[PDB]
C-alpha cells in the first residue's frame, strides 16, 4: 500500500521487533502444545537396585496430569499465550493509526497528493527558476492541496491518535516488564507436588520435573531482551514526540531555501504528517513546501496567461 513513507525508522524497527516477538510466541505455544509435560515420581520413605513404587502406568499418568494442573505454577504453563496476547496487542496498536476509516482516508489522500506533488514537473520547474495541459494539471493539484489543507488542519484526530498509540505502547511495555521480571527465577526445573491423592495411589508427596522448563526460561530471557529493546525504541519515540512541538510546522527553513517566501505555517495533523515525512525523507517535504507558496501560484497564473495570450 506504499505506507512505508509514513513509517519512520523507529516504526520499522518496532514492526520488525513485533514480528520477531510474534514468531517467538508462536514457537513457544507450539512447544506448549507439542511436548509440554511433567514427569513425577513419588517420594519413597527412607549391590544397588531400583525402587519399586507399585504404581501402574496410568497411575503415573494421573499423577503427572494432577501435578501439572496443580503443582506447576500458572506462569510456567501460560507464558506463551500471554506472550501471544502481548504481541497481538502491540501489532494492533502499531496498525491502529492507519486502520480507522477517517484516519485511513486522511492518510490515503495525503499519500496520493504527496505522490502527485513528488512526480509533478511543476515543482522541478519552480525549483529550477511550459505546456497548457501541465498548467491545468498543476492548477488542479494546487486546488486539491488547498482543499486538503482546509479539510485536515481543522481537526487534530491523527496526532491525538498517534499520541494515544505511543502512550499505550509505553504503558504496556512498562507493565509487561514489571510483571515479567517477577517471574524470571521463579520458573524452575524441579517441583514438589502435594496433590492429596493418597486414596488413589498411596503416596502423599511427589517430586516432579517440568520437561519444558529450561527451554521456556531461555525463550523468556530472549523475549525480555527483545521487549527491553522495544521499550528503548518506544522511549526514544516518545522523546522525539515531546522534543519538538508537532502541533505546528515552521516553514522558515523551506522559505529561506526556496525562492518563494509566501509559505503559510501548517498546523495540526497536516503538520504532524509533514513532520513524519521529514523524518522519513526531506525531498517530499520540500516538494510540499514549494507547492504551498503563493509566488508559485502567481508564476503558474502568469505562465497560463502567456500560453492563452
Amino acid at each position: 500500500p506504499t505506507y512505508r513513507i509514513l513509517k519512520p525508522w523507529w516504526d520499522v524497527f518496532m514492526d520488525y521487533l513485533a514480528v520477531v516477538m510474534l514468531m517467538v510466541a508462536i514457537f513457544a505455544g507450539t512447544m506448549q502444545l507439542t511436548k509440554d509435560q511433567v514427569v513425577c515420581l513419588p517420594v519413597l520413605p527412607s549391590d544397588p537396585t531400583g525402587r519399586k513404587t507399585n504404581l501402574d502406568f496410568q497411575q503415573y499418568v494421573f499423577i503427572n496430569q494432577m501435578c501439572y494442573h496443580l503443582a506447576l505454577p500458572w506462569y510456567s504453563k501460560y507464558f506463551p499465550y500471554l506472550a501471544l496476547i502481548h504481541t497481538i496487542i502491540l501489532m494492533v496498536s502499531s496498525n491502529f493509526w492507519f486502520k480507522y476509516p477517517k484516519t485511513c482516508s486522511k492518510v490515503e489522500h495525503f499519500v496520493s497528493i504527496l505522490g502527485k506533488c513528488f512526480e509533478s514537473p511543476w515543482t522541478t520547474k519552480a525549483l529550477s527558476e511550459l505546456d497548457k495541459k501541465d498548467g491545468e494539471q498543476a492548477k488542479a493539484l494546487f486546488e486539491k492541496v488547498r482543499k486538503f489543507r482546509a479539510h485536515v488542519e481543522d481537526s487534530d484526530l491523527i496526532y491525538k491518535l498517534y499520541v494515544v498509540q505511543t502512550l499505550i505502547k509505553t504503558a504496556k511495555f512498562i507493565f509487561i516488564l514489571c510483571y515479567t521480571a517477577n517471574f524470571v527465577n521463579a520458573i524452575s526445573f524441579e517441583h514438589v507436588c502435594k496433590p492429596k491423592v493418597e486414596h488413589l495411589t498411596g503416596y502423599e508427596v511427589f517430586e516432579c520435573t517440568h520437561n519444558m522448563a529450561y527451554m521456556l526460561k531461555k525463550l523468556l530471557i530472549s523475549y525480555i531482551s527483545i521487549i527491553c529493546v522495544y521499550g528503548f525504541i518506544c522511549l526514544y519515540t516518545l522523546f522525539w514526540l515531546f522534543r519538538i512541538p508537532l502541533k505546528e510546522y515552521s516553514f522558515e527553513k523551506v522559505r529561506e531555501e526556496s525562492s518563494f517566501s509566501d509559505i503559510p505555517d501548517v498546523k495540526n495533523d497536516f503538520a504532524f504528517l509533514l513532520h513524519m515525512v521529514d523524518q522519513y525523507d526531506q525531498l517530499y517535504s520540500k516538494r510540499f513546501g514549494v507547492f504551498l507558496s503563493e509566488v508559485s501560484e502567481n508564476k503558474l497564473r502568469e505562465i497560463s496567461l502567456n500560453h492563452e495570450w
Binding site: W9, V12, C40, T49, G50, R51
Partner: protein
C-alpha cells in the same frame, strides 16, 4: 526486482549461503523439538565417577516406565552439554544476524531512499534513447532528456555531499566478518561436545535407586553432521566476506574515475564523483559496466551542450 543491480556476485553467494544455513537451522530446530531425546540405563557396577563397563540373560533394574522417563528427562536437562541442546537455536540466531546485516541498508530509510532513487535514475538513464543517440530527435524526447539531465544534476548535488551509505556498508561488512570469526571460533571449539554416549551422576538415588546412568543421544550424529555442514558453510561465507572487505579496502571506493570511459568515448570532461556516488558506480561496474558507461553520458558537459543545441534546433 530492481535491486539486483545493487547485489554483486559475492552478495548473491552470501544470500544463498545464508538461505541454506537458515534451512539447516530450521531442520535442526524441528529435529530438536520433535525427535530429540535421551535413552538412559543405570550402571549397577560403578568403580569411578563415570560408568564402569564389564547362556546369557538380561539384567533387571526393577525400574518402572515413568522412572525411566524421569531418569531420561533429568539426565537430558542436567548432564547434557549446552551446545548439543541449543545448536539449532544458535544457528538460527546467527542466520538472522547475517540476514539483518545484509538487509539493514535496504531497510534503513536514510540509505534505502538514496539507493532506490539511484536505482530508478539509473534505470531511466539506461532506457533513455538520448544515451543511445549520443553514444552512437523528437521534441518530447529532447525535453525528457533535459529534465532527466536536471534530475541527474540535482541527484549528484544531493547525494555526493554525503557518504552515509558507504559507511553503513563498511560497518555491515565489518560486523559480518567479526561474527564469522566468533562463529568459527566457538562452534569449532564446542564441536567435540556432541557425542553419543554421556554418563550422568544427577543424584536421584532417593527416587530411582541408582547413582550413575549411561545415556544415548539418538540425534548426536545428525547434529554433528549438521554442525560440520554449518561450519563449512560459515567458512565459505567468511571467505567471501574477507574477499569483499579486501576489495573494499584495496582501493579508495569514494573516488570514481571515468578515465576508461572518457578514453573510449569522445567526451573528456566527465566529472569525478565521490562519497556514495563513487561507491555505487563501483558496485554497478562490478555488476555490469554497460550501465555505468551509459550513465556516464549524463555527467559530461559536452553532452549537455549537444542536447541544448538539439533542443534549440527543434524549438524553432
Amino acid at each position: 526486482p530492481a535491486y539486483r543491480i545493487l547485489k554483486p556476485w559475492w552478495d548473491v553467494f552470501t544470500d544463498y549461503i545464508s538461505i541454506v544455513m537458515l534451512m539447516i537451522a530450521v531442520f535442526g530446530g524441528t529435529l530438536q523439538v520433535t525427535q530429540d531425546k535421551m535413552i538412559c540405563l543405570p550402571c549397577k557396577w560403578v568403580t569411578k565417577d563415570s560408568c564402569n563397563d564389564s547362556g546369557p540373560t538380561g539384567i533387571k533394574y526393577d525400574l518402572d516406565r515413568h522412572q525411566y522417563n524421569y531418569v531420561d528427562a533429568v539426565c537430558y536437562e542436567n548432564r547434557l552439554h549446552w551446545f548439543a541442546k541449543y545448536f539449532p537455536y544458535l544457528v538460527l540466531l546467527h542466520t538472522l544476524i547475517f540476514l539483518a546485516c545484509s538487509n539493514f541498508w535496504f531497510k534503513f530509510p536514510r540509505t534505502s531512499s538514496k539507493l532506490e532513487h539511484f536505482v530508478s535514475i539509473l534505470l531511466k538513464c539506461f532506457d533513455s534513447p538520448w544515451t543511445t543517440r549520443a553514444l552512437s530527435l523528437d521534441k518530447k524526447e529532447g525535453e525528457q532528456a533535459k529534465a532527466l539531465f536536471e534530475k541527474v544534476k540535482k541527484f549528484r548535488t544531493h547525494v555526493e555531499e554525503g557518504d552515509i551509505v558507504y559507511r553503513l556498508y563498511m560497518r555491515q561488512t565489518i560486523i559480518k566478518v567479526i561474527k564469522f570469526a566468533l562463529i568459527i571460533c566457538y562452534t569449532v571449539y564446542y564441536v567435540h561436545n556432541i557425542k553419543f554416549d554421556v554418563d550422568c551422576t544427577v543424584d536421584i538415588e532417593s527416587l530411582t535407586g541408582y547413582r550413575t546412568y549411561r545415556c544415548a543421544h539418538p540425534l548426536a550424529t545428525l547434529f554433528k553432521i549438521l554442525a560440520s555442514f554449518y561450519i563449512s558453510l560459515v567458512i565459505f561465507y567468511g571467505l567471501i566476506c574477507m574477499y569483499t572487505l579486501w576489495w573494499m579496502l584495496r582501493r579508495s571506493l569514494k573516488k570514481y574515475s571515468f578515465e576508461s570511459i572518457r578514453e573510449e568515448s569522445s567526451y573528456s570532461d566527465i566529472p569525478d564523483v565521490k562519497n556514495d556516488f563513487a561507491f555505487m558506480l563501483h558496485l554497478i561496474d562490478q555488476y555490469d559496466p554497460l550501465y555505468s558507461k551509459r550513465f556516464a553520458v549524463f555527467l559530461s558537459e559536452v553532452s549537455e551542450n549537444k542536447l541544448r543545441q538539439l533542443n534549440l534546433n527543434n524549438e524553432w
